[PDB]
Amino acid sequence: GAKKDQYFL
Amino acid sequence: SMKKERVITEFWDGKIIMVSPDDPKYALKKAEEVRELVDSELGFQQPSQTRTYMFVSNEKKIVGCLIAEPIREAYRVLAEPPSLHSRAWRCSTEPEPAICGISRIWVFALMRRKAIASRMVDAVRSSFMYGSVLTTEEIAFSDPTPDGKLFASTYCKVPDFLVYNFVS
Ligand SMILES: *C(=O)[C@H](C)SCCNC(=O)CCNC(=O)[C@H](O)C(C)(C)COP(=O)(O)OP(=O)(O)OC[C@H]1O[C@@H](n2cnc3c(N)ncnc32)[C@H](O)[C@@H]1OP(=O)(O)O
């Protein structure tokens, strides 16, 4: 779905 | 009288305006409309501190938008070891201080690669904090799309620019 990626520590 | 339009910077091919939280309701309603358009293009279904910057074409169309909000810290995006035989990124655990969070940034697809996004980020840096010009190490981007990561690394001139998720 969404175009934003995920960003984690 | 009807309040004045807040022009930040002007160019041959348009102008950058800003909507602030205390502006008239028709302005805040225009800002909401634009945010809904942008979230829809990003594929998202659905306050007193965000500023909405808009790049307005000479035909009076909003062809760029940048939603900015105050933040206090952000995190360097880091490289991930590739997998040998082949979407989430990992950031530094050390927060760094930051002032301005770029929550959304969007340019009309047929007008991309014409420095609209770069000029909008310049305008934010020049106007977000009264009397100061923010450096590229005082801004951060929320969970970038692939387009956004390419833009941000070029604009900030480093691969490990600052990122944050969202102010809750
Ligand atoms: C969450 O919202 C986060 C805030 S990230 C959201 C990013 N927005 C999107 O993903 C929506 C759709 N994409 C866009 O709206 C646009 O691609 C951007 C807003 C990301 C970029 O807008 P613009 O096209 O106006 O950027 P610039 O002209 O100012 O580019 C300056 C330099 O940035 C590099 N670059 C930009 N865009 C690139 C893309 N697709 N691919 C590769 N590199 C890209 C270039 O180096 C560019 O300089 P040039 O002289 O054009 O090379």
Coordinates of N, CA, C and O and ligand atoms in Angstrom, one line a residue:
Chain A
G1 N 0.8 -1.2 0.0 CA 0.0 0.0 0.0 C 0.8 1.3 0.0 O 1.2 1.8 -1.0
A2 N 1.1 1.8 1.2 CA 1.7 3.1 1.3 C 3.1 3.2 0.8 O 3.9 2.2 0.8
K3 N 3.4 4.4 0.2 CA 4.7 4.5 -0.4 C 5.9 4.8 0.5 O 7.1 4.6 0.2
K4 N 5.6 5.2 1.7 CA 6.6 5.5 2.7 C 7.2 4.2 3.2 O 6.4 3.3 3.6
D5 N 8.5 4.2 3.4 CA 9.2 3.0 3.9 C 9.1 3.0 5.4 O 8.5 4.0 6.0
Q6 N 9.6 2.0 6.1 CA 9.6 1.9 7.5 C 11.0 2.2 7.9 O 12.0 1.8 7.3
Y7 N 11.2 2.9 9.1 CA 12.5 3.3 9.6 C 12.5 2.9 11.1 O 11.6 3.4 11.8
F8 N 13.5 2.1 11.4 CA 13.6 1.5 12.8 C 14.9 1.9 13.4 O 15.8 2.3 12.7
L9 N 15.0 1.7 14.7 CA 16.3 1.8 15.4 C 17.1 0.5 15.2 O 18.2 0.5 14.9
Chain B
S1 N -10.7 43.9 6.5 CA -10.5 43.3 5.2 C -10.0 41.8 5.3 O -9.6 41.4 6.4
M2 N -10.1 41.1 4.2 CA -9.6 39.8 4.1 C -8.1 39.8 4.2 O -7.4 40.6 3.6
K3 N -7.6 38.8 5.0 CA -6.2 38.8 5.4 C -5.3 38.6 4.2 O -5.7 38.1 3.2
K4 N -4.1 39.1 4.3 CA -3.1 39.0 3.2 C -2.6 37.6 3.0 O -2.5 36.8 4.0
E5 N -2.1 37.3 1.8 CA -1.5 36.1 1.5 C -0.1 36.2 2.0 O 0.6 37.2 1.8
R6 N 0.4 35.1 2.6 CA 1.8 35.2 3.1 C 2.8 34.6 2.2 O 2.9 33.3 2.1
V7 N 3.4 35.4 1.4 CA 4.4 35.0 0.4 C 5.8 35.0 1.1 O 6.2 36.0 1.7
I8 N 6.5 33.8 0.9 CA 7.8 33.7 1.5 C 8.9 34.0 0.6 O 9.8 34.7 0.9
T9 N 8.8 33.4 -0.7 CA 9.8 33.7 -1.7 C 9.0 33.7 -3.0 O 8.0 33.0 -3.1
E10 N 9.5 34.5 -4.0 CA 8.9 34.6 -5.3 C 9.9 34.3 -6.4 O 11.1 34.6 -6.2
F11 N 9.4 33.7 -7.5 CA 10.2 33.2 -8.6 C 9.6 33.5 -9.9 O 8.4 33.9 -10.0
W12 N 10.3 33.3 -11.0 CA 9.8 33.6 -12.3 C 8.6 32.6 -12.6 O 7.7 32.9 -13.3
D13 N 8.7 31.4 -12.1 CA 7.8 30.3 -12.4 C 6.8 30.0 -11.2 O 6.1 29.0 -11.2
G14 N 6.8 30.9 -10.2 CA 5.7 30.8 -9.2 C 6.2 31.4 -7.9 O 7.2 32.1 -7.8
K15 N 5.4 31.2 -6.8 CA 5.7 31.7 -5.5 C 5.4 30.7 -4.4 O 4.6 29.8 -4.6
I16 N 6.2 30.8 -3.3 CA 6.0 30.0 -2.2 C 5.2 30.7 -1.1 O 5.7 31.8 -0.7
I17 N 4.0 30.2 -0.8 CA 3.2 30.8 0.3 C 3.2 29.9 1.5 O 3.6 28.7 1.4
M18 N 2.8 30.4 2.6 CA 2.7 29.6 3.8 C 1.4 29.8 4.6 O 1.0 31.0 4.7
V19 N 0.8 28.8 5.0 CA -0.4 28.8 5.8 C 0.0 28.4 7.2 O 0.7 27.4 7.4
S20 N -0.3 29.2 8.2 CA 0.0 29.1 9.6 C -1.3 28.7 10.4 O -2.4 28.9 9.9
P21 N -1.1 28.1 11.6 CA -2.3 27.6 12.3 C -3.4 28.7 12.6 O -4.6 28.3 12.7
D22 N -3.0 29.9 12.8 CA -3.9 31.0 13.2 C -4.6 31.7 12.0 O -5.2 32.7 12.3
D23 N -4.4 31.2 10.8 CA -5.0 31.9 9.6 C -6.5 31.6 9.5 O -7.0 30.8 10.1
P24 N -7.1 32.4 8.6 CA -8.5 32.2 8.4 C -9.0 30.8 8.0 O -8.2 30.0 7.5
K25 N -10.2 30.5 8.3 CA -10.7 29.1 8.1 C -10.6 28.7 6.7 O -10.4 27.5 6.4
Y26 N -10.9 29.6 5.7 CA -10.8 29.2 4.3 C -9.4 28.8 3.9 O -9.1 28.0 3.0
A27 N -8.4 29.4 4.6 CA -7.0 29.1 4.3 C -6.6 27.7 4.9 O -6.2 26.8 4.2
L28 N -6.9 27.5 6.2 CA -6.7 26.2 6.8 C -7.5 25.1 6.1 O -7.0 24.0 6.0
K29 N -8.6 25.5 5.5 CA -9.4 24.5 4.8 C -8.7 24.1 3.5 O -8.7 23.0 3.1
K30 N -8.1 25.1 2.8 CA -7.3 24.8 1.6 C -6.1 24.0 2.0 O -5.8 23.0 1.3
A31 N -5.4 24.2 3.1 CA -4.3 23.4 3.6 C -4.7 22.0 3.8 O -3.9 21.1 3.5
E32 N -5.8 21.8 4.4 CA -6.4 20.4 4.7 C -6.6 19.7 3.4 O -6.2 18.6 3.2
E33 N -7.2 20.4 2.4 CA -7.5 19.8 1.1 C -6.2 19.3 0.5 O -6.1 18.2 -0.1
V34 N -5.1 20.1 0.5 CA -3.9 19.8 -0.1 C -3.2 18.6 0.7 O -2.7 17.7 0.0
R35 N -3.3 18.6 2.0 CA -2.8 17.5 2.7 C -3.5 16.2 2.4 O -2.9 15.1 2.3
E36 N -4.8 16.2 2.2 CA -5.5 15.0 1.8 C -5.1 14.6 0.5 O -4.9 13.4 0.2
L37 N -4.9 15.5 -0.5 CA -4.4 15.1 -1.8 C -3.1 14.3 -1.7 O -2.9 13.3 -2.2
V38 N -2.1 14.9 -0.9 CA -0.8 14.4 -0.8 C -0.8 13.0 -0.1 O -0.1 12.0 -0.6
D39 N -1.5 12.8 1.0 CA -1.7 11.5 1.6 C -2.3 10.5 0.7 O -1.9 9.3 0.7
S40 N -3.3 10.9 -0.1 CA -3.9 10.0 -1.0 C -2.8 9.5 -2.0 O -2.7 8.3 -2.3
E41 N -2.0 10.4 -2.6 CA -1.0 10.0 -3.5 C 0.1 9.1 -2.7 O 0.6 8.2 -3.3
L42 N 0.3 9.3 -1.5 CA 1.2 8.5 -0.7 C 0.6 7.1 -0.4 O 1.3 6.2 -0.1
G43 N -0.7 7.0 -0.6 CA -1.5 5.8 -0.2 C -1.9 5.7 1.3 O -2.0 4.6 1.8
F44 N -2.1 6.8 2.0 CA -2.7 6.9 3.3 C -4.2 7.1 3.2 O -4.6 8.0 2.5
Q45 N -4.9 6.3 4.0 CA -6.4 6.6 4.1 C -6.6 7.9 4.7 O -6.9 8.9 4.0
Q46 N -6.6 8.1 6.1 CA -6.8 9.3 6.7 C -6.2 9.3 8.1 O -6.8 9.6 9.2
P47 N -1.6 19.8 14.1 CA -2.7 20.6 14.6 C -2.2 22.1 14.8 O -1.9 22.7 13.8
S48 N -2.1 22.5 16.0 CA -1.9 23.9 16.3 C -0.4 24.3 16.0 O 0.0 25.5 16.3
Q49 N 0.4 23.4 15.5 CA 1.8 23.7 15.3 C 2.3 23.5 13.8 O 3.4 23.8 13.6
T50 N 1.5 22.9 12.9 CA 2.1 22.6 11.6 C 1.9 23.9 10.7 O 1.0 24.7 10.9
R51 N 2.9 24.1 9.9 CA 2.8 25.1 8.8 C 2.8 24.4 7.4 O 3.6 23.5 7.2
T52 N 1.9 24.9 6.6 CA 1.8 24.3 5.2 C 2.3 25.3 4.2 O 1.8 26.4 4.0
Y53 N 3.5 24.9 3.6 CA 4.1 25.7 2.5 C 3.6 25.2 1.2 O 3.5 24.0 1.0
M54 N 3.2 26.1 0.3 CA 2.7 25.7 -1.0 C 3.4 26.4 -2.1 O 3.6 27.6 -2.0
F55 N 3.9 25.7 -3.1 CA 4.4 26.3 -4.3 C 3.3 26.5 -5.3 O 2.7 25.6 -5.7
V56 N 3.0 27.8 -5.6 CA 1.9 28.1 -6.5 C 2.4 28.5 -7.8 O 3.2 29.5 -7.9
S57 N 1.9 27.9 -8.9 CA 2.3 28.2 -10.2 C 1.8 29.5 -10.7 O 0.9 30.1 -10.1
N58 N 2.3 30.0 -11.8 CA 1.8 31.3 -12.3 C 0.3 31.1 -12.8 O -0.4 32.1 -12.9
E59 N -0.2 29.9 -13.0 CA -1.6 29.7 -13.3 C -2.4 29.5 -12.0 O -3.5 29.1 -12.1
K60 N -1.8 29.9 -10.9 CA -2.5 29.8 -9.6 C -2.9 28.4 -9.2 O -3.9 28.2 -8.5
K61 N -2.1 27.4 -9.6 CA -2.3 26.1 -9.1 C -1.3 25.7 -8.1 O -0.1 26.0 -8.2
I62 N -1.7 24.9 -7.1 CA -0.7 24.4 -6.1 C 0.0 23.2 -6.6 O -0.6 22.1 -6.7
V63 N 1.2 23.4 -7.1 CA 2.0 22.3 -7.7 C 3.0 21.7 -6.8 O 3.7 20.8 -7.1
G64 N 3.1 22.3 -5.6 CA 4.1 21.8 -4.6 C 3.5 22.1 -3.2 O 2.8 23.0 -2.9
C65 N 3.9 21.2 -2.3 CA 3.4 21.3 -0.9 C 4.5 20.7 0.0 O 5.1 19.7 -0.3
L66 N 4.7 21.4 1.2 CA 5.6 20.9 2.2 C 4.9 21.2 3.6 O 4.7 22.3 3.9
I67 N 4.7 20.1 4.4 CA 4.1 20.3 5.7 C 5.2 20.2 6.7 O 5.9 19.2 6.8
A68 N 5.4 21.2 7.5 CA 6.4 21.3 8.4 C 5.9 21.4 9.8 O 4.8 22.0 10.0
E69 N 6.6 20.9 10.8 CA 6.1 20.8 12.2 C 7.4 20.9 13.1 O 8.4 20.4 12.8
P70 N 7.2 21.4 14.3 CA 8.4 21.4 15.3 C 8.7 20.0 15.8 O 7.8 19.2 16.0
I71 N 10.0 19.7 16.0 CA 10.5 18.5 16.5 C 11.6 18.9 17.4 O 12.1 20.0 17.5
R72 N 12.1 17.9 18.2 CA 13.3 18.2 19.1 C 14.5 17.3 18.7 O 15.6 17.7 19.0
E73 N 14.3 16.1 18.1 CA 15.3 15.2 17.9 C 15.0 14.5 16.6 O 13.8 14.4 16.2
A74 N 16.0 13.8 16.0 CA 15.8 13.0 14.9 C 17.0 12.1 14.8 O 17.9 12.2 15.6
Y75 N 17.0 11.1 13.9 CA 17.9 10.0 13.9 C 18.5 9.8 12.5 O 17.8 9.9 11.5
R76 N 19.8 9.6 12.4 CA 20.5 9.4 11.2 C 20.1 8.1 10.6 O 20.0 7.1 11.2
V77 N 19.7 8.1 9.3 CA 19.5 6.9 8.6 C 20.8 6.2 8.2 O 21.7 6.8 7.8
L78 N 20.8 4.8 8.4 CA 22.0 4.1 8.2 C 21.9 3.0 7.1 O 20.9 2.7 6.7
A79 N 23.1 2.6 6.7 CA 23.2 1.6 5.6 C 22.9 0.2 6.2 O 23.2 -0.1 7.3
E80 N 22.1 -0.6 5.4 CA 21.9 -1.9 5.8 C 22.7 -2.9 5.0 O 22.7 -2.8 3.8
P81 N 23.4 -3.8 5.7 CA 24.1 -4.9 4.9 C 23.2 -5.5 3.9 O 22.1 -6.1 4.3
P82 N 23.5 -5.5 2.7 CA 22.7 -6.2 1.7 C 22.6 -7.7 2.0 O 23.5 -8.3 2.6
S83 N 21.5 -8.3 1.6 CA 21.4 -9.8 1.6 C 22.0 -10.4 0.4 O 21.9 -9.9 -0.7
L84 N 22.7 -11.5 0.6 CA 23.4 -12.2 -0.5 C 22.6 -12.6 -1.7 O 23.0 -12.4 -2.9
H85 N 21.5 -13.3 -1.5 CA 20.6 -13.7 -2.5 C 19.3 -13.0 -2.3 O 18.2 -13.7 -2.3
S86 N 19.3 -11.7 -2.2 CA 18.2 -10.8 -1.9 C 17.1 -11.6 -1.0 O 17.4 -11.9 0.2
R87 N 9.5 -2.9 3.3 CA 10.7 -2.1 3.1 C 11.1 -1.3 4.3 O 10.6 -0.2 4.5
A88 N 12.1 -1.8 5.1 CA 12.4 -1.2 6.3 C 13.9 -0.8 6.4 O 14.8 -1.6 6.0
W89 N 14.2 0.4 6.9 CA 15.5 0.9 7.2 C 15.8 1.0 8.7 O 14.9 1.0 9.5
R90 N 17.1 1.0 9.0 CA 17.5 1.1 10.4 C 18.3 2.4 10.5 O 19.0 2.8 9.6
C91 N 18.0 3.1 11.6 CA 18.6 4.3 12.0 C 19.5 4.2 13.2 O 19.4 3.3 14.0
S92 N 20.3 5.3 13.3 CA 21.1 5.4 14.5 C 20.2 5.5 15.8 O 19.2 6.1 15.8
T93 N 20.8 4.9 16.8 CA 20.1 4.9 18.1 C 20.4 6.2 18.9 O 19.7 6.6 19.8
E94 N 21.5 6.9 18.5 CA 21.8 8.2 19.1 C 20.9 9.3 18.5 O 21.2 9.7 17.3
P95 N 20.0 9.9 19.2 CA 19.2 11.0 18.6 C 20.2 12.2 18.5 O 21.1 12.4 19.3
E96 N 19.9 13.1 17.5 CA 20.5 14.3 17.3 C 19.5 15.5 17.4 O 18.3 15.2 17.1
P97 N 19.9 16.6 17.9 CA 18.9 17.7 18.0 C 18.5 18.2 16.7 O 19.3 18.3 15.7
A98 N 17.2 18.5 16.6 CA 16.7 19.1 15.3 C 15.5 19.9 15.7 O 14.8 19.8 16.7
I99 N 15.1 20.8 14.7 CA 14.2 21.9 15.0 C 12.9 21.7 14.2 O 11.8 21.9 14.6
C100 N 13.1 21.3 12.9 CA 12.0 21.3 11.9 C 11.8 19.9 11.3 O 12.8 19.3 10.8
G101 N 10.6 19.4 11.4 CA 10.3 18.1 10.8 C 9.5 18.3 9.5 O 8.5 18.9 9.5
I102 N 10.1 17.8 8.4 CA 9.4 17.8 7.2 C 8.5 16.5 7.1 O 9.0 15.4 7.0
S103 N 7.2 16.8 7.4 CA 6.2 15.7 7.6 C 5.8 15.1 6.2 O 5.6 13.9 6.1
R104 N 5.5 16.0 5.3 CA 5.1 15.7 3.9 C 5.8 16.6 3.0 O 6.1 17.8 3.3
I105 N 6.2 16.1 1.8 CA 6.7 17.0 0.8 C 6.3 16.4 -0.5 O 6.4 15.2 -0.7
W106 N 5.7 17.2 -1.4 CA 5.1 16.7 -2.6 C 5.2 17.8 -3.7 O 5.0 19.0 -3.5
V107 N 5.5 17.3 -4.9 CA 5.5 18.1 -6.2 C 4.6 17.3 -7.2 O 4.7 16.1 -7.4
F108 N 3.8 18.1 -7.9 CA 3.0 17.6 -9.0 C 3.9 16.8 -10.0 O 4.9 17.3 -10.5
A109 N 3.5 15.5 -10.3 CA 4.3 14.6 -11.0 C 4.9 15.2 -12.3 O 6.0 15.1 -12.7
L110 N 4.0 15.9 -13.1 CA 4.5 16.5 -14.3 C 5.5 17.7 -14.1 O 6.0 18.1 -15.1
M111 N 5.7 18.1 -12.9 CA 6.6 19.2 -12.7 C 7.8 18.9 -11.8 O 8.5 19.8 -11.2
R112 N 8.1 17.6 -11.7 CA 9.2 17.2 -10.8 C 10.5 17.4 -11.6 O 10.5 17.6 -12.8
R113 N 11.6 17.4 -10.8 CA 12.9 17.7 -11.3 C 13.1 19.1 -11.9 O 13.9 19.4 -12.8
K114 N 12.3 20.0 -11.3 CA 12.4 21.5 -11.6 C 12.7 22.3 -10.4 O 12.4 23.5 -10.3
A115 N 13.3 21.7 -9.3 CA 13.8 22.3 -8.1 C 12.6 22.9 -7.3 O 12.9 23.8 -6.4
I116 N 11.4 22.5 -7.5 CA 10.3 23.0 -6.6 C 10.5 22.5 -5.2 O 10.4 23.2 -4.2
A117 N 10.8 21.2 -5.0 CA 11.0 20.7 -3.7 C 12.2 21.3 -3.0 O 12.1 21.7 -1.8
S118 N 13.3 21.5 -3.7 CA 14.5 22.1 -3.1 C 14.2 23.5 -2.7 O 14.6 24.0 -1.6
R119 N 13.4 24.3 -3.5 CA 13.1 25.6 -3.2 C 12.2 25.7 -2.0 O 12.2 26.6 -1.2
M120 N 11.3 24.7 -1.9 CA 10.4 24.7 -0.8 C 11.1 24.4 0.5 O 10.9 25.1 1.5
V121 N 12.1 23.5 0.5 CA 12.9 23.3 1.7 C 13.7 24.5 2.0 O 13.9 24.8 3.2
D122 N 14.3 25.2 1.0 CA 14.9 26.5 1.3 C 14.0 27.5 2.0 O 14.4 28.1 2.9
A123 N 12.8 27.6 1.5 CA 11.9 28.5 2.1 C 11.6 28.1 3.5 O 11.5 29.0 4.4
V124 N 11.4 26.8 3.8 CA 11.1 26.4 5.2 C 12.3 26.8 6.1 O 12.2 27.3 7.2
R125 N 13.5 26.5 5.6 CA 14.7 26.8 6.4 C 14.8 28.3 6.7 O 15.4 28.6 7.7
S126 N 14.4 29.1 5.8 CA 14.5 30.6 5.9 C 13.4 31.2 6.8 O 13.5 32.4 7.1
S127 N 12.3 30.5 7.0 CA 11.1 31.1 7.6 C 10.6 30.4 8.8 O 9.6 30.9 9.4
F128 N 11.1 29.2 9.1 CA 10.4 28.4 10.2 C 10.7 29.0 11.5 O 9.8 29.0 12.4
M129 N 11.9 29.5 11.8 CA 12.3 30.0 13.0 C 12.7 31.5 12.8 O 13.6 31.8 12.2
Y130 N 11.9 32.3 13.5 CA 12.0 33.8 13.3 C 13.5 34.1 13.6 O 14.1 33.7 14.5
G131 N 14.1 35.0 12.7 CA 15.4 35.5 12.8 C 16.5 34.6 12.5 O 17.7 35.1 12.6
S132 N 16.3 33.4 12.0 CA 17.3 32.5 11.8 C 17.1 31.7 10.5 O 16.0 31.7 10.0
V133 N 18.2 31.1 10.0 CA 18.2 30.2 8.9 C 18.7 28.9 9.3 O 19.9 28.7 9.7
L134 N 17.8 27.9 9.3 CA 18.1 26.5 9.7 C 19.1 25.9 8.8 O 19.0 26.0 7.6
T135 N 20.1 25.2 9.3 CA 21.0 24.4 8.5 C 20.4 23.1 8.1 O 19.3 22.6 8.6
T136 N 21.0 22.4 7.2 CA 20.5 21.1 6.8 C 20.6 20.0 7.8 O 20.0 18.9 7.7
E137 N 21.3 20.3 8.9 CA 21.4 19.4 10.1 C 20.4 19.7 11.1 O 20.3 19.0 12.2
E138 N 19.6 20.7 10.9 CA 18.5 21.0 11.8 C 17.1 20.7 11.2 O 16.1 20.9 11.9
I139 N 17.1 20.0 10.1 CA 15.8 19.6 9.5 C 15.9 18.0 9.4 O 17.0 17.4 9.4
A140 N 14.8 17.4 9.5 CA 14.7 15.9 9.4 C 13.4 15.7 8.6 O 12.5 16.5 8.5
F141 N 13.3 14.5 8.0 CA 12.3 14.0 7.1 C 11.5 12.9 7.7 O 12.2 12.0 8.3
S142 N 10.2 12.8 7.7 CA 9.5 11.7 8.2 C 9.5 10.5 7.3 O 9.3 10.7 6.0
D143 N 9.7 9.3 7.8 CA 9.7 8.1 7.0 C 9.7 8.3 5.5 O 8.6 8.2 4.9
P144 N 10.8 8.6 4.9 CA 10.8 8.9 3.5 C 10.4 7.8 2.5 O 10.7 6.6 2.7
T145 N 9.6 8.2 1.5 CA 9.4 7.3 0.4 C 10.7 7.1 -0.3 O 11.7 7.8 -0.1
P146 N 10.8 6.2 -1.3 CA 12.0 6.1 -2.1 C 12.4 7.4 -2.8 O 13.5 7.8 -2.8
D147 N 11.4 8.1 -3.5 CA 11.6 9.4 -4.1 C 12.2 10.4 -3.0 O 13.1 11.1 -3.3
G148 N 11.6 10.4 -1.8 CA 12.0 11.3 -0.8 C 13.4 11.0 -0.3 O 14.2 12.0 0.1
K149 N 13.8 9.8 -0.2 CA 15.2 9.5 0.2 C 16.2 10.0 -0.8 O 17.2 10.5 -0.5
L150 N 15.8 9.8 -2.1 CA 16.7 10.3 -3.2 C 16.8 11.8 -3.1 O 17.8 12.4 -3.3
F151 N 15.6 12.5 -2.8 CA 15.7 13.9 -2.8 C 16.4 14.4 -1.6 O 17.3 15.2 -1.7
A152 N 16.2 13.8 -0.4 CA 16.7 14.3 0.8 C 18.3 14.1 0.8 O 19.0 15.0 1.4
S153 N 18.8 13.0 0.3 CA 20.2 12.8 0.3 C 20.9 13.8 -0.6 O 21.9 14.4 -0.2
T154 N 20.3 14.0 -1.7 CA 20.9 15.0 -2.6 C 20.8 16.4 -2.0 O 21.8 17.2 -2.1
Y155 N 19.7 16.8 -1.4 CA 19.5 18.1 -0.8 C 20.4 18.4 0.3 O 21.1 19.4 0.4
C156 N 20.5 17.4 1.3 CA 21.3 17.6 2.4 C 22.8 17.2 2.2 O 23.6 17.3 3.0
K157 N 23.0 16.6 1.0 CA 24.4 16.3 0.5 C 25.0 15.2 1.3 O 26.2 15.0 1.2
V158 N 24.2 14.3 2.0 CA 24.8 13.2 2.6 C 23.8 12.0 2.6 O 22.6 12.2 2.5
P159 N 24.3 10.8 2.6 CA 23.4 9.7 2.6 C 22.7 9.5 3.9 O 21.5 8.9 3.9
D160 N 23.3 9.9 5.0 CA 22.7 9.6 6.3 C 22.1 10.9 6.9 O 22.5 11.5 7.9
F161 N 21.0 11.4 6.2 CA 20.3 12.6 6.7 C 19.4 12.2 7.8 O 19.2 11.0 8.2
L162 N 18.7 13.2 8.4 CA 17.9 12.9 9.6 C 16.5 12.5 9.3 O 15.9 13.1 8.4
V163 N 16.0 11.6 10.0 CA 14.7 11.0 9.8 C 14.0 11.0 11.2 O 14.7 10.9 12.2
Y164 N 12.7 11.0 11.2 CA 11.8 10.8 12.3 C 10.6 10.1 11.8 O 10.3 10.0 10.6
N165 N 9.8 9.5 12.8 CA 8.6 8.8 12.3 C 7.3 9.7 12.3 O 6.7 9.8 11.2
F166 N 7.0 10.3 13.4 CA 5.9 11.3 13.6 C 5.8 11.8 15.0 O 6.2 11.1 15.9
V167 N 5.4 13.1 15.2 CA 5.2 13.6 16.5 C 3.9 13.1 17.1 O 2.8 13.4 16.5
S168 N 4.0 12.4 18.2 CA 2.7 11.9 18.9 C 2.6 12.6 20.2 O 2.7 13.9 20.3
Ligands
LIG1 C1 7.1 11.7 3.7 O1 6.2 12.3 3.1 C2 8.5 12.1 3.5 C3 8.4 13.6 3.9 S1 9.1 11.7 1.9 C4 7.8 12.1 0.7 C5 8.5 12.4 -0.6 N1 7.4 12.7 -1.6 C6 6.9 11.7 -2.5 O2 7.3 10.6 -2.5 C7 5.7 12.1 -3.4 C8 6.1 11.9 -4.9 N2 7.4 12.4 -5.2 C9 7.6 13.8 -5.2 O3 6.8 14.6 -5.0 C10 9.0 14.3 -5.6 O4 9.7 13.3 -6.1 C11 9.9 14.9 -4.5 C12 9.1 15.9 -3.5 C13 10.5 13.8 -3.6 C14 11.0 15.7 -5.1 O5 10.4 16.9 -5.7 P1 11.3 17.6 -6.8 O6 11.2 16.8 -8.1 O7 10.7 18.9 -7.1 O8 12.8 17.6 -6.3 P2 14.0 18.5 -6.9 O9 13.7 19.0 -8.3 O10 14.2 19.8 -6.0 O11 15.4 17.6 -6.8 C15 16.6 18.1 -6.3 C16 17.5 16.8 -6.4 O12 17.0 15.9 -5.7 C17 17.3 14.6 -6.5 N3 16.3 13.8 -6.9 C18 15.2 14.4 -6.7 N4 14.1 13.7 -7.1 C19 14.7 12.5 -7.5 C20 14.1 11.4 -8.0 N5 12.8 10.8 -8.4 N6 14.9 10.3 -8.4 C21 16.2 10.4 -8.3 N7 16.8 11.6 -7.8 C22 16.0 12.6 -7.4 C23 18.0 15.1 -7.8 O13 19.5 14.9 -7.5 C24 17.6 16.3 -7.9 O14 18.6 17.2 -8.6 P3 18.6 17.2 -10.2 O15 19.3 18.4 -10.8 O16 17.2 17.2 -10.8 O17 19.2 15.9 -10.6

